[PDB]
Design a protein around this ligand. Structure first.
Ligand code: SF4
Ligand SMILES: [Mg+2]
Ligand SMILES: [Mg+2]
Ligand SMILES: [Mg+2]
Ligand SMILES: [Mg+2]
Ligand SMILES: [Mg+2]
Ligand SMILES: [Mg+2]
Ligand SMILES: [Mg+2]
Ligand SMILES: [Mg+2]
Ligand SMILES: [Mg+2]
Ligand SMILES: [Mg+2]
Ligand SMILES: [Mg+2]
Ligand SMILES: [Mg+2]
Ligand SMILES: [Mg+2]
Ligand SMILES: [Mg+2]
Ligand SMILES: [Mg+2]
Ligand SMILES: [Mg+2]
Ligand SMILES: [Mg+2]
Ligand SMILES: [Mg+2]
Ligand SMILES: [Mg+2]
Ligand SMILES: [Mg+2]
Ligand SMILES: [Mg+2]
Ligand SMILES: [Mg+2]
Ligand SMILES: [Mg+2]
Ligand SMILES: [Mg+2]
Ligand SMILES: [Mg+2]
Ligand SMILES: [Mg+2]
Ligand SMILES: [Mg+2]
Ligand SMILES: [Mg+2]
Ligand SMILES: [Mg+2]
Ligand SMILES: [Mg+2]
Ligand SMILES: [Mg+2]
Ligand SMILES: [Mg+2]
Ligand SMILES: [Mg+2]
Ligand SMILES: [Mg+2]
Ligand SMILES: [Mg+2]
Ligand SMILES: [Mg+2]
Ligand SMILES: [Mg+2]
Ligand SMILES: [Mg+2]
Ligand SMILES: [Mg+2]
Ligand SMILES: [Mg+2]
Ligand SMILES: [Mg+2]
Ligand SMILES: [Mg+2]
Ligand SMILES: [Mg+2]
Ligand SMILES: [Mg+2]
Ligand SMILES: [Mg+2]
Ligand SMILES: [Mg+2]
Ligand SMILES: [Mg+2]
Ligand SMILES: [Mg+2]
Ligand SMILES: [Mg+2]
Ligand SMILES: [Mg+2]
Ligand SMILES: [Mg+2]
Ligand SMILES: [Mg+2]
Ligand SMILES: [Mg+2]
Ligand SMILES: [Mg+2]
Ligand SMILES: [Mg+2]
Ligand SMILES: [Mg+2]
Ligand SMILES: [Mg+2]
Ligand SMILES: [Mg+2]
Ligand SMILES: [Mg+2]
Ligand SMILES: [Mg+2]
Ligand SMILES: [Mg+2]
Ligand SMILES: [Mg+2]
Ligand SMILES: [Mg+2]
Ligand SMILES: [Mg+2]
Ligand SMILES: [Mg+2]
Ligand SMILES: [Mg+2]
Ligand SMILES: [Mg+2]
Ligand SMILES: [Mg+2]
Ligand SMILES: [Mg+2]
Ligand SMILES: [Mg+2]
Ligand SMILES: [Mg+2]
Ligand SMILES: [Mg+2]
Ligand SMILES: [Mg+2]
Ligand SMILES: [Mg+2]
Ligand SMILES: [Mg+2]
Ligand SMILES: [Mg+2]
Ligand SMILES: [Mg+2]
Ligand SMILES: [Mg+2]
Ligand SMILES: [Mg+2]
Ligand SMILES: [Mg+2]
Ligand SMILES: [Mg+2]
Ligand SMILES: [Mg+2]
Ligand SMILES: [Mg+2]
Ligand SMILES: [Mg+2]
Ligand SMILES: [Mg+2]
Ligand SMILES: [Mg+2]
Ligand SMILES: [Mg+2]
Ligand SMILES: [Mg+2]
Lengths: 231, 137, 148, 208
RNA sequence: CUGGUCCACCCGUGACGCUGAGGCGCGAAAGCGUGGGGAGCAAACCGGAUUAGAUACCCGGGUAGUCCACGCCCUAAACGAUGCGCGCUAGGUCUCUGGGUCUCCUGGGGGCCGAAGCUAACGCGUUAAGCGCGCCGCCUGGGGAGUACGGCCGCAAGGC
RNA sequence: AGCGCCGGCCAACUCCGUGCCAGCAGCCGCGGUAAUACGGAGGGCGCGAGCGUUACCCGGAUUCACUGGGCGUAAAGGGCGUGUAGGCGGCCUGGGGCGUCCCAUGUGAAAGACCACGGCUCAACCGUGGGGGAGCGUGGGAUACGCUCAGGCUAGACGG
């Protein structure tokens, strides 16, 4: 499912703001820009997707993590396709390490779903309606994707392992495997299954994540053709 | 450069600690023998006589353990511990009866004997002592 | 279930206007006497809470010690800060020769005959941590050749 | 000499039943049955956690008070056992059990070791024929420990020996009743005897 | 007039090296001796303030000295409170100064942030306080005390 | 049958007397009218013809650190060069065999020490037998490392 002209969309970036541990995944710096060995990206995807597929057909969740503005929506898109949890907005410390406690906050969201499902007394004061609404709206912003996650994930998918340092550290502290799209400014050794490629351009994120989902959806029953994306 | 042997052991220790594939040490017959033992005991993958900018060297191919889970995924070293015993400042010599057991057998003592460079096991079999070069584990 | 031993329980203070206010800390080792031990340091505003909390971490952080006829496989020495612990294999008639802190941890680990020595700083906490990370570095003839 | 004083208070302090009298030890008039709490004004107050030192002291005193032996002889025997080959714990207990006054008691010649001592001391016992009036004599394998034929017509030994007719005697011993004589077969395992004693704690006490 | 030092060429010598108890030399300021010099400044000193007082701080004066030559003195928070040499162990960034092919690369300095590692912590981190070897100096609870005594040095002060 | 002890270290708690007094104290510390810390008592703990005290030695003290420590701020880098002795020293080959390693051998008295057996009723004590070792003398052997003598080398150092 992997394709070959990802060259058409990314082959890496960033001038010498690199992490030396990312050396083995670099071809050269042509424009004064670290360019990624796309053959390495291929070979890695082969190893990585193999892990993904196996995890899919054994029926276990993958928590997709993206928070940078460019990968914001694109992860809500494709993770929804998989029907798998994501965190798009703020990564709340202890989402894994303090799971049960954060999960105490979906119940609130849950209980606000029901209460506002009407009426169960709209005879609650004026000032309260506005409040609890603002609450639900609020809760909705952050726990929208995390609410699907009803128990500790089997692995996580990160768009930027550097940006998402905390998440990488939480999962790792829990022996939960970590798969990641990572460019030259990330730390390879911290990542279990690497996608050495640009993590900034939405194009690359789109290619890698959508095609990642195509692995997920295909392996747990049926398949499907193209998924929503901005040019 | 006062102790080539200690420099070599140290060149290795520094390299393994940051997980280099190999490392180069300036070459000598006596160093080869030590590496010979090091490889044949599995502390290193092996070595080869290479040349750096015209100069004879020994490229030592490092070996580690499997990647690990948890917060620190760096793999366990194969050579945890290597340090000189006999030094230019204080030569150390043992007779066959004074040869030490490194780490209850889990490690090796390398010595230079009048039968050549041997491990503590080897030296004890051949029944000879010598200068206690270093210990590895 | 495992066996528990409280090694250290201390009261500490913090200063505020109007006076000091206290908090308690508990060192607890946990083990089955068959090769599983764990160490946790629990602190809370009253003793029994702290002790229980210490129990929790003790179970979370465990370690597998490779017992052999009731002794450890090889000599090991470990430094934790200024605290240094020395561990030496010992034969059947020996017993566990150690101070209260490393004894408890070794004892619950199923060690029956060992020689030890505390060097450097003998801070109970740092010595307990050092003992653990020493056990954690014990290898077997198997482990050794497997690596190499 | 030996402790030679009130003996129930010893079991009471030690929190376990030590059988230091014989008969009354099995009666309901036993003190451990009536008041199983330490002697003196403070017996019924709640115990605070015993220190490690405390623990090992007690375990050692238990083992000691069992044999009515001095701390001196006790320590010497221990020191002998430590430098002696093998495992200290067994060897210590073995050497303890090899005391004449002890063997005399294990063979039912007496109800207590205190009584056994007075028997040995007063020469009413012999070892391989020869009279031995020293409680400290180390009985070795193959020794015949008999009543003195000049003392065989003694009330106490009789009533005691009557009580032993088919009564079992430890695997390491053999008693020929009616003949009033017994034999020492071999030195007893820690296993081969069930003393209310963790003898490792004694090792730890003397390593302080 | 004269020392150190860096670079490029890789031309010559062929381990000629490292350190270094003693020794020798250098060694800020203040101070000393002989002689000059003396504007400004300024110990001591005199006066005015301030203040409860003010042998100070502030103000107005003011002599050594501060400067030059020669000879002494030999101390210091003489500090990076970090001996010298060599090898090894991510990088990022600013800068000084060489050589490239001048994007940038590579030498030698001077900073900053940081990999691994170290550290009691603070912090250090290719200008190590990391990992090693060599040699030297030094520490071994606080005060008494860098005092006394002895010795050596100094004109003295006083130094070791 | 006695002696010490019962605040923590450190095993053993209460009543009275006292009221920063009398006194205790190895260290930390106790005593100012409800003292488990002084004095007695009851009780308890520990040893027992002994128990405690003073003195001194080794230990705990890796607190002179060979095993086995340190010196930025804790005590600790010489103010800095220069250099004498000394310590230490790159790559290859050969001679010698000094250090070093191995074997043989002589010496290592007896007592003591350790294992076994045995004699005094046991023990202490004593007898009998057994196994060593370093160290040095001698003989033969080994040559990797260190040393030395010899010959090459250019990677250190120096010079053009
Ligand atoms: S009677 Fe009960 S208490 Fe008194 S000695 Fe016999 S066992 Fe011990
Ligand atoms: Mg990025
Ligand atoms: Mg050494
Ligand atoms: Mg410490
Ligand atoms: Mg340290
Ligand atoms: Mg063993
Ligand atoms: Mg200390
Ligand atoms: Mg202390
Ligand atoms: Mg293991
Ligand atoms: Mg009984
Ligand atoms: Mg215990
Ligand atoms: Mg023994
Ligand atoms: Mg039985
Ligand atoms: Mg019994
Ligand atoms: Mg002792
Ligand atoms: Mg040339
Ligand atoms: Mg030439
Ligand atoms: Mg000098
Ligand atoms: Mg001067
Ligand atoms: Mg001057
Ligand atoms: Mg002057
Ligand atoms: Mg003058
Ligand atoms: Mg002058
Ligand atoms: Mg004059
Ligand atoms: Mg003048
Ligand atoms: Mg003037
Ligand atoms: Mg004035
Ligand atoms: Mg005035
Ligand atoms: Mg006045
Ligand atoms: Mg004035
Ligand atoms: Mg003025
Ligand atoms: Mg003026
Ligand atoms: Mg003057
Ligand atoms: Mg003058
Ligand atoms: Mg003057
Ligand atoms: Mg001058
Ligand atoms: Mg000087
Ligand atoms: Mg300065
Ligand atoms: Mg400097
Ligand atoms: Mg200084
Ligand atoms: Mg120096
Ligand atoms: Mg230029
Ligand atoms: Mg430049
Ligand atoms: Mg630089
Ligand atoms: Mg820094
Ligand atoms: Mg770090
Ligand atoms: Mg260090
Ligand atoms: Mg480097
Ligand atoms: Mg740098
Ligand atoms: Mg520099
Ligand atoms: Mg330091
Ligand atoms: Mg002093
Ligand atoms: Mg002076
Ligand atoms: Mg002075
Ligand atoms: Mg004088
Ligand atoms: Mg000085
Ligand atoms: Mg006492
Ligand atoms: Mg009190
Ligand atoms: Mg005591
Ligand atoms: Mg107590
Ligand atoms: Mg009075
Ligand atoms: Mg007293
Ligand atoms: Mg009061
Ligand atoms: Mg009172
Ligand atoms: Mg007292
Ligand atoms: Mg009292
Ligand atoms: Mg006596
Ligand atoms: Mg002492
Ligand atoms: Mg010592
Ligand atoms: Mg040392
Ligand atoms: Mg120290
Ligand atoms: Mg130093
Ligand atoms: Mg200082
Ligand atoms: Mg300096
Ligand atoms: Mg020099
Ligand atoms: Mg010289
Ligand atoms: Mg030399
Ligand atoms: Mg050499
Ligand atoms: Mg030679
Ligand atoms: Mg030769
Ligand atoms: Mg020789
Ligand atoms: Mg000999
Ligand atoms: Mg002899
Ligand atoms: Mg006999
Ligand atoms: Mg011996
Ligand atoms: Mg010879
Ligand atoms: Mg030569
Ligand atoms: Mg050169
Ligand atoms: Mg040159």
């Amino acid at each position: 499912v992997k394709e070959l002209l990802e060259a058409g969309v990314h082959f890496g970036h960033e001038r010498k703001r690199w992490n030396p541990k990312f050396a083995r995944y670099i071809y050269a710096e042509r424009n004064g820009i670290h360019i990624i060995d796309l053959q390495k990206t291929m070979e890695e995807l082969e190893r990585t997707f193999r892990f993904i597929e196996d995890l899919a057909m054994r029926g276990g969740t993958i928590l997709f993590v993206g928070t940078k503005k460019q990968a914001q929506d694109i992860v809500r898109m494709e993770a929804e396709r998989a029907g798998m949890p994501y965190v798009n907005q703020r990564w709340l410390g202890g989402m894994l390490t303090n799971f049960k406690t954060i999960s105490q906050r979906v119940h609130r969201l849950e209980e606000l779903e029901a209460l506002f499902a009407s009426p169960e007394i709209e005879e609650r004061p004026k000032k309260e309606q506005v409040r609890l609404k603002h609450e639900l709206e609020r809760l909705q912003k952050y726990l929208s994707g995390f609410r699907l996650l009803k128990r500790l994930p089997d692995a996580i998918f990160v768009v930027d392992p550097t940006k998402e340092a905390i998440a990488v550290r939480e999962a790792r502290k829990l022996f939960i495997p970590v798969i990641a799209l990572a460019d030259t400014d990330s730390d390879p050794d911290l990542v279990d299954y690497i996608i050495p490629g640009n993590d900034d351009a939405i194009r690359s994120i789109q290619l890698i994540l959508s095609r990642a989902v195509d692995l997920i959806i295909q392996a747990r029953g049926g398949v499907v053709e193209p998924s929503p994306s901005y040019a | 450069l006062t102790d080539p042997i200690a420099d070599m052991l140290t060149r290795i220790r520094n390299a393994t600690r940051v997980y280099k594939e190999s490392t180069d040490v300036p070459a000598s017959r006596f160093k080869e023998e030590i590496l010979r033992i090091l490889a044949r005991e599995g502390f290193i993958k092996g070595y080869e006589r290479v040349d750096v900018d015209g100069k004879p060297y020994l490229r030592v191919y490092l070996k580690y353990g499997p990647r690990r889970q948890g917060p620190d995924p760096r793999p366990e070293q194969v050579i945890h511990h290597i340090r000189r015993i006999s030094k230019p400042g204080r030569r150390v010599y043992v007779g066959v009866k004074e040869i030490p057991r490194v780490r209850r057998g889990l490690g090796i003592a390398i010595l230079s004997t009048s039968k050549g460079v041997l491990t503590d096991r080897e030296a004890r079999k051949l029944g000879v002592g010598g200068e206690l070069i270093c210990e590895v584990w | 279930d495992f066996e528990e031993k409280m090694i250290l329980i201390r009261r500490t203070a913090r200063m505020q206007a109007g006076g000091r206010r206290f908090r308690f800390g508990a060192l607890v080792v946990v083990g089955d006497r068959q090769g599983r031990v764990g160490l946790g340091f629990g602190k809370a505003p009253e003793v029994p809470l702290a002790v229980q909390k210490a129990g929790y971490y003790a179970r979370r952080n465990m370690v597998e010690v490779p017992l052999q006829n009731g002794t450890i496989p090889h000599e090991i020495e470990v430094e934790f800060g200024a605290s240094k612990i020395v561990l030496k294999p010992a034969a059947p008639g020996t017993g566990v020769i150690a101070g209260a802190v490393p004894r408890a941890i070794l004892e619950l680990a199923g060690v029956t005959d060992i020689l030890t020595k505390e060097l450097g700083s003998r801070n109970p906490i740092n010595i307990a941590y050092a003992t653990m990370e020493a056990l954690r570095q014990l290898r077997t003839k198997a482990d050794v050749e497997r690596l190499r | 000499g030996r402790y030679i004083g009130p003996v129930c208070r010893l079991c009471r302090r030690e929190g376990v039943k030590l059988y230091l009298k014989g008969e009354r030890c099995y009666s309901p008039k036993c003190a451990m049955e009536r008041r199983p709490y330490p002697p003196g004004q403070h017996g019924q107050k709640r115990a605070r956690r015993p220190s490690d030192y405390a623990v090992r002291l007690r375990e050692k005193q238990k083992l000691r008070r069992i044999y009515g032996i001095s701390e001196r002889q006790f320590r010497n025997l221990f020191e002998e056992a430590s430098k002696k080959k093998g495992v200290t714990g067994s060897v210590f207990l073995g050497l303890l059990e090899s005391r004449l006054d002890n063997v005399v008691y294990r063979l039912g010649f007496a109800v207590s070791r205190r009584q056994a001592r007075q028997l040995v001391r007063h020469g009413h016992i012999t070892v391989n024929g020869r009279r031995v009036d020293l409680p400290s004599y180390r009985v070795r394998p193959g020794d015949e420990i008999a009543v003195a034929e000049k003392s065989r017509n003694l009330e106490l030994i009789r009533q005691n020996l009557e009580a032993m007719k088919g009564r079992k005697v430890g695997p390491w011993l053999s008693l020929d009743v009616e003949g009033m004589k017994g034999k020492f077969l071999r030195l007893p395992d820690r296993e081969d005897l069930a003393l209310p004693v963790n003898e490792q704690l004694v090792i730890e006490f003397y390593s302080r």
